Symmetry: D2
């Protein structure tokens, strides 16, 4: 189960670089130089890395310092052959963003947020990124009177429209991906799920430029089924990128390594990406627990990849098994893929077998054979066939 | 706090008519004749009622029995002056719908579901309904292999497209409202939230015919903020109807009377509907608890209306208070309503006060004064000014 | 992975016998005669069955009918060699129990509840049951004013004390097990978790007679860690029985087959029961989904047992692996089992290496190596060593 | 609604002193000197303050610096007349506690944790504290193999036993209060709820010395009913202290001001404390949101007290209303307070009216009149009588 750069596994600098500060605790690990992370990731078999502006260039850096930071990073990429398929902006750490970036009540702040974003879009293109993520972690509220949501959506639309005008005018080959999260750090965050983000995109001036970047843990903090949310993004043609990690139910965002948390949901996600022919990066947005030292960080990162490869194998074996193919037919998955009324409205209306003469009791008596199918799925996942 | 028919309060037959059967218990109350419910509701000050096909005409009724059921109902409406602004279909009780209506794996079932729906659309128009609700309570799964979500969305789209073709061809003045719910009775239900339903509508052939019917308790079963979800529906121009009730967090769907459950969320919802000028029905989809007799049912129904009227009064007093208007200015709600960059992209890019010369520390130091505003909101809700 | 009666697997009559009625739907399956369930379970390899009074003898049965029902059941047991290790009372279905059994506000009801319970204790002993379960599904409330919890606990204590006096006086060899659940069917249920039930037992007149019957899904409806709750019951010497099934997070109680829901939590539960030497019944309290016919019911029941046996194998392989034993030492599990201060209070107070000279930074720098250990656990579960 | 020192309102230094650092953000406010907090709290009408060792004396302080810190604090208390009714230990911030204090795997750490605790017990007594709280925020795990819960409970018991031996030997007049929390910062924390802590106390060598310190938000992060948990602590005679704040459901711990979050649950809590004659401190463990400046901190602190006083008034009016007293009788609250069988076991067994002649249908038909009672409760809370 050895990964190679062909598996397209990526990691954010902020993941293996998390120092372990939490709401109740100081850091347990020293900071990692981005160059070191690049090298260690390459040795593990990763394909590339991602970054927030602030991960690469310390906030408030002079143009001189900025150039120096970039050059060193670029050298590491050249030395290892690692790519940079996505980048994003930090619009959440600094105190100025306490009420949001694009939807802060203060107009001056909103203008600042757009300028900080545009500067990073330029760098991202320079580095070859294909996707630019936006997670509005501070857009929301803890109380009802603080934010008029209709006005905030107007402000969010305005912001994304200006970014689309910008890339268009420059002639850049980059697309945007919005990342939803229901809460934390705000009481409630705007665009809380994959559905809310998809619905919002349809109101932008150039909808073709925007998709979603769903994250496992995020949809599970609302108790939603991740594989179902991803199927809806695929159906809309909007899965531009994906964030993989683990989460144990509805609580604070844990960011465990991928495979931990809900294992069966991880299995069904892998089955789907692989069946659907998803060809984007398999990005891990996780945090090695603060209990670990450096050895532990690398082990956790390696486990992310290992878990994906084991699941891939098990899902493939599941779909290729003749006995499973037979069970899918038994459960009428074939019939779900056929049109209900290709014959049209009129033909449906005139068809007595559809109502007048339909034997409802006979249809009701037919078992779905879902439990036998699910048990074959479990046997496959566990290597117990 | 007396309601009148002008307040536009409505109730489903199934609400005051719930006999009290739950997953672990038999009925505690006898069935109510629809005619009796109409009369009792009129006396309490309700404006109208709503129904599923099966609430009005017992499943499997002959055409003769059907006509008889309708005529009696129509007489009650005439006697009391009650209206019927919405109707819907039961595609969840009968065993034939065990795997869904529009997205059942069996094709024969899907065809049956559409025929049963079309028959009720005809009645709804006859009775003067303006809105037709669709809650797909059985569309979903308990296991991953049972439903290919991409195929199910194809099937759901096909179903809604055929219904749109139908109303168009007949020349009916009726619009559709999709009602999301995250789970129960299925393990996971498709289109689980207000966002997922809004995103789906944008892919239908004639999107103008469809909106949402959000329900308080439903979004709270996913731990989402209801007033925020409603603001997004308002922003999209898609709030065609609304279901009001109460819920105590993430658990089974309780369906308490409106006002019970999350009281502060009820306050913010009322403030919003009233501020936004929502002119549709205020419908209560709730269940008087099984502990109650008939006297208790009517008391609970009366409480739904009473609670809305008290909240309306308190929200109005909140918005009209000079001291609140001053606090909103202090918290920069005025600034949130102004465009970020009406000056345009170029002007933003050339504005040094937006980046180069922006004093981030001075901006960061500005308190939002949100807690004083929230305390004025609490004082108002409690009548403690 | 074939079960035999030696594995001690048991099922309630109500599990494979669930007809599929839910809050929104009618039954999908016909009722099963208890004799048929006994025979089918024996053929699958089960060790025994359990029952509520009402599952075996229809409510309101004459003494004549009662005897007839028992005799037929007894014949089935003799024919198959199945045992009856536990029984319980139905104090939740009939409308009289709408406000509870032992804690109903009406005193007459409370007296009735105790009489119905005592009659079943007698039968249970006759059939050879060793454990009597009590799940107070209707003890609780939907509103704050309806129940004074202090008075209700007095009433609950009184009830359990009288039952203890009863078994003592009769000389029966039976112990009681209280089963907690947080909600459903009441808004909140009293004694909502394993901890609340353990704390309550310590206030009864003869605490030795009572333990807990925890259920997987129940603790997961509160988002708690089941294996941790079971370890606390084991530590107190109070795990008298256990209910196994599956649950997908915080929502309505699903009652999936064991192994479904949280698979990793199922793995850790098996590891614990097996390590601790739990020698009681492995009882399955689950519901085959309403989508299934009879073939599906038996397949789901078979899957419960299969899943336990696979997990048992994987946990055993995990604990026996030399490389795991080494990792446990690396993570200081050995040190957690040694007393902190067997030397005593004074020796601790005088030990400078414990404070004055303790090198906090050196201790802080030591990684716990938890992620490598967890990855070995995952590899083992998946059969990927 | 003006508080006075007689209302017994207290605050932790860490509450109004929270700088606003979260998992995703830097501090938004400067640190407050403990002397300033004491003075500002006194002016608002607070009765006293509480502290962790580390809030008062910076970690790693010399004995010289320690004495200086104490003296300054003592002067502030004398100047204002504020008291210190409770103190606690910080066993969670420093990296050495990454795996816990009392239950860390490393034995050396466990010994250190006890020494740090004993030093603070001494100071607490010097300052006049009556209660010593213990919140084991780092005792728990993120993975199943990392902690053997049976061994950890042995370790936790050992720790509390040694602390009891210590206070006993010194002759101190102080009692311990254990504070449960389900998760955050660990994946799962040991003793997750009020029930688990109550059950654990019963296994300590001198159970009389220990009680619980429940916190509103903590039990709500598991979706439990706080007023019910408090009634069980009252019933056991174990409510030694209480932490008041607000929380919006199952998510990260928000720590809103008291009254925010679940308002109806706040009403029922106040009704209970006041009815039961709770005479301990009304302590606020909350965090003014990071959006606020200093003015906002004081406003939020003032709101905590204001909200309690308004609720107190409304609960008192509720209980004193003749119409409510009549409704309570209608709902049989009087009957819940009478013994079920003061006549005894034998008399119950011989009473035909309890079974043989009990009219179950007549009893079942009796409505509980809970909704009318709940509506009177709502009317009272809202000042709408
Ligand atoms: O909840 C944290 C989010 O996952 C972020 O890591 C984004 O993906 C990048 O800003
Ligand atoms: O969860 C139940 C839903 O609220 C239904 O009552 C719909 O509104 C009507 O089918
Ligand atoms: O939630 C349902 C409970 O699990 C019951 O099945 C008990 O175990 C028996 O009354
Ligand atoms: O979750 C944080 C806890 O409430 C702490 O504030 C304790 O009360 C004191 O250590
Ligand atoms: Mg996250
Ligand atoms: Mg992410
Ligand atoms: Mg509902
Ligand atoms: Mg509804
Ligand atoms: Mg259950
Ligand atoms: Mg059970
Ligand atoms: Mg907290
Ligand atoms: Mg606290």
């Amino acid at each position: 189960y050895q990964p190679t750069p062909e598996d397209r596994f990526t990691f954010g600098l902020w993941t293996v670089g998390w120092q372990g500060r939490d709401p109740f605790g100081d850091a347990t690990r020293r900071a990692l130089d981005p160059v070191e992370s690049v090298r260690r990731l390459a040795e593990l078999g990763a394909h590339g890395v991602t970054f927030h502006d602030d991960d690469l260039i310390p906030f408030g850096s002079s143009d001189s310092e900025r150039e120096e930071h970039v050059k060193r990073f670029r050298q590491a990429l050249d030395d290892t052959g690692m790519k940079v398929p996505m980048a994003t902006t930090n619009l959440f750490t600094h105190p100025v963003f306490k009420d949001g970036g694009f939807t802060a009540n203060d107009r001056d702040v909103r203008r600042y947020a757009l300028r900080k974003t545009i500067r990073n879009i330029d760098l991202a293109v320079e580095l070859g990124a294909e996707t630019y993520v936006a997670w509005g972690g501070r857009e929301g509220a803890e109380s009802g009177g603080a934010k008029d949501v209709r006005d905030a959506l107007d402000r969010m639309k305005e912001a994304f429209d200006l970014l689309g005008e910008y890339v268009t005018s420059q002639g850049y080959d980059i697309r945007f991906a919005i990342e939803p999260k229901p809460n934390e750090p705000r009481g409630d965050i705007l665009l809380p799920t994959v559905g809310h983000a998809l619905a919002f995109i349809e109101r932008l001036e150039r909808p073709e430029l925007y998709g979603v970047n769903p994250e496992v843990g995020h949809e599970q903090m609302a108790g939603l089924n991740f594989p179902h949310g991803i199927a809806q993004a695929l159906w809309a043609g909007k899965l531009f990128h994906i964030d993989l990690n683990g989460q144990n139910g509805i609580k604070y965002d844990q960011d465990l390594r991928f495979g931990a948390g809900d294992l069966r949901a991880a299995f069904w996600l892998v089955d789907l990406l692989e069946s659907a022919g998803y060809s984007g990066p398999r990005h891990f947005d996780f945090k090695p627990p603060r209990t670990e030292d450096f050895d532990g960080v690398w082990a956790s990162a390696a486990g992310c990849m290992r878990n994906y490869l084991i699941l891939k194998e098990r899902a493939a074996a599941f779909r290729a098994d003749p006995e499973v193919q037979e069970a899918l037919r038994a459960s009428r998955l074939d019939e779900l893929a056929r049109p209900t009324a290709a014959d049209g409205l009129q033909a449906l209306l005139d068809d007595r077998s559809a109502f007048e003469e339909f034997d409802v009791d006979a249809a009701a008596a037919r078992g779905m054979a879902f439990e036998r199918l699910d048990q074959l799925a479990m046997d496959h996942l566990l290597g117990a066939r």
